[PDB]
Amino acid sequence: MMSIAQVRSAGSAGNYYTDKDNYYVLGSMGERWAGRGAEQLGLQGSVDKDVFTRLLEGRLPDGADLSRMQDGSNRHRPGYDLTFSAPKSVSMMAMLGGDKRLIDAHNQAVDFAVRQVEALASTRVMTDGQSETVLTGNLVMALFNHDTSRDQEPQLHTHAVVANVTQHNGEWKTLSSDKVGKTGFIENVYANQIAFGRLYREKLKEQVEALGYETEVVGKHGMWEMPGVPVEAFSVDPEIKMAEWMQTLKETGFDIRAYRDAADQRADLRTLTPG
Ligand SMILES: [Mg+2]
């Protein structure tokens, strides 16, 4: 699904989203800029921690500055964290079963959902004494893949960090609003939390099933898993953590390789089937 949360203070944000220990099992952080806005600022590909931090403060790479220093602290809201988590079985098959094209599938699902989120981008602009929200359609995002849950179990996820900035008629303005009122961006993202989650969730299922794997619905809002995967056995030196995960995986008796060959055969079976 997709969880929502205030982005973590511009101060510690950088190291929080990027220190190697959040993506050790994955190998790389697979981090990247996203959004029409990032493109407008010439931000593409790998993410510079310093530029990212600055972005959270309101300092953009083109000179624009939305920071608000007040008595020693910046009062510009850093932004938001939209976290897309893959289902347990997928996380396991990806980082314990070594099937990396599932990481790609996930990445493809996040890109897809995030593009929909972007259509909600907007800002408050008052004209004629009447203020109203105006769709803006551009965001500046930095995505980071992590592989570990809060309780140290495998969890492939992407923290889609949305900077609190958007361009309007050439001016960089804030998504947040210093005044309660006519529904803004993040309120609209909440009203649609299940839907964005369903978008991601359903896009992943298409990719995943394309690779040959099977899926079965196990809960509300199309929540699904891959049949047969020991999801139950999975509810700080990452090297040790991996060691344990791999061990508890063996204790289940599950045959990873056999599971994948089955997915390969099923896949080929479908491509070579006109009747
Ligand atoms: Mg994380």
Overall form: globular
Distance between the termini: 37 Å
How many domains would you count in the coordinates?
2
User: Which percent bin holds the helix content?
Assistant: 25-40%
Per DSSP, the total helix count is: 9
Note the main sheet: 5 strands, antiparallel
What is the C-alpha radius of gyration, as a whole number of Å?
21 Å
Bound molecules: magnesium ion
Query: What is the strand tally?
Result: 13
Order of helices and strands: EHEHHEEEHHEEEEEEHHEEHH
Strand order of the largest sheet: 1-5-9-8-2
Structural class: alpha+beta
Strand content: 15-25%
Quaternary structure classification: monomer
Active site: 16-17
Binding site for Mg(2+): 146, 157, 159
Subcellular location: Cytoplasm
Subunit structure: Monomer. Part of the relaxosome, a complex composed of plasmid-encodes TraI, TraM, TraY and host-encoded IHF bound to the F plasmid origin of transfer (oriT). Directly contacts coupling protein TraD. Seems to directly contact TraM via its C-terminus.
Q: Which helices and strands, and how do they pair?
A:
Layout: E1 2-6, H1 10-18, E2 32-34, H2 36-40, H3 49-57, E3 69-70, E4 73-74, E5 79-85, H4 88-95, H5 101-118, E6 122-127, E7 130-135, E8 141-148, E9 154-163, E10 166-168, E11 171-173, H6 185-191, H7 193-210, E12 216-217, E13 224-225, H8 238-250, H9 256-271
Antiparallel strand pairs: 1-5, 2-8, 3-4, 5-9, 6-7, 8-9, 10-11, 12-13
This protein binds magnesium ion (MG).
Magnesium ion (MG) binds at residues 22, 146, 157, 159.
